[PDB]
Amino acid sequence: QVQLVQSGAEVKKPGASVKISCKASGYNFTTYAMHWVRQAPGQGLEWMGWINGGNGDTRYSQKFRGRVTISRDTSASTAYMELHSLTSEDTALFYCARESGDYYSEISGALDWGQGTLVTVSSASTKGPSVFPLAPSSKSTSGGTAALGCLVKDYFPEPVTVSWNSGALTSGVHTFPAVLQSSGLYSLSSVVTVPSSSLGTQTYICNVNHKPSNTKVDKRVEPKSC
Amino acid sequence: YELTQPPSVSVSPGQTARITCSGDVLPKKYAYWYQQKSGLAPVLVIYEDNRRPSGIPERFSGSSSGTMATLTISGAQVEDEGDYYCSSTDSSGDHYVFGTGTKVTVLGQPKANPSVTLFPPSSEELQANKATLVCLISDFYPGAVTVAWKADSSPVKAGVETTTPSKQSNNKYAASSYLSLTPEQWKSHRSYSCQVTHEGSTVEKTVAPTECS
């Protein structure tokens, strides 16, 4: 099974460079080329360039030629994209994708894709989140069902992931996309819908992971007391 | 090199949706089609003008003639909503481009009134000398809402930050709005309200600093 695993999210200051990696397995790395694709938030796909895993030749789109270096290391079965002299407007998600075409392939096109790598560029520094419980009041239930949650406040950069009870609860979970505030910091919320009779006796914990700051928080959400 | 696509195509359930892609060198070069659904990597649905990868449903087909390639979705279903991009090389063949992209909407989906969940500042946040009101809007359709905040019976705009709506997995939409206050502001009003208006109707939730449940 073809597998492409990209490196994790990055944050850089303007003028820095970043080298993203794309580790390939499950096929002969030197037989195929690797594409690199950019997608700025809320915009379309932009093809950046590609490289032969075998002979290492590259081509770059007009937009990125002279700003990026695509390379490959066959002994590590990995393709690389380096973006030089970043500015804040460079913030985007980047994808690698294997070209399936070959003299002896019945298919062509980018069949297999990496999971994406977010790169954020800002003069601001990384900031871990402040996590607060969102406890449902007696007035705020929905009958036999109640919504409780966690506020993940004032962090930077994206992304943040939230699970509940270490993943024992998934079907009632709704994790909302973050808002980007005027301060340049993000906030998001996650709620889980649970039995209303369970509130005083079942334990609910949101597990917050902010890898850019090396931070994880397990926040216990207790019924409103007074 | 631009591959021109219509920004939007709508289709009724069970009808045939067609997405075109125009480019000057399509007569000599193959077209490829990618489907990208909310929050996922693109998926290859048609390659070399008219061939279909394994595992792609038979209702996807493609053709290309002259300077226009066409992606056809026969008997379109709700799961076919997404952004579709064609792809091809420029004249040199050294570079690919993606087309301008098409959002496919499937008509006739059920209207859904928004669920509104409003949380006051937690005592934990207030004890940290901060206060945030959290208004969470989920499971609405179509995907447009307006959110307004009130303090007592007066509008509030200062401190409000609202997201754009985003498609959930179940094809409805969600959004959120935050009102940031000092603890002093919070305690100095009888109540605060989050008012969500959707298709001409409004759901308003209220919280009060005297409510500690």
Binding site: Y32, I51, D57, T58, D102 | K29, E48, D94
Partner: peptide
């Protein structure tokens, strides 16, 4: 019939 472009400097007719 058309030219298939599979990599930098790598292409063939089908």
């Amino acid at each position: 019939r058309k030219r298939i472009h599979i990599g930098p400097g790598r292409a063939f007719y089908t």
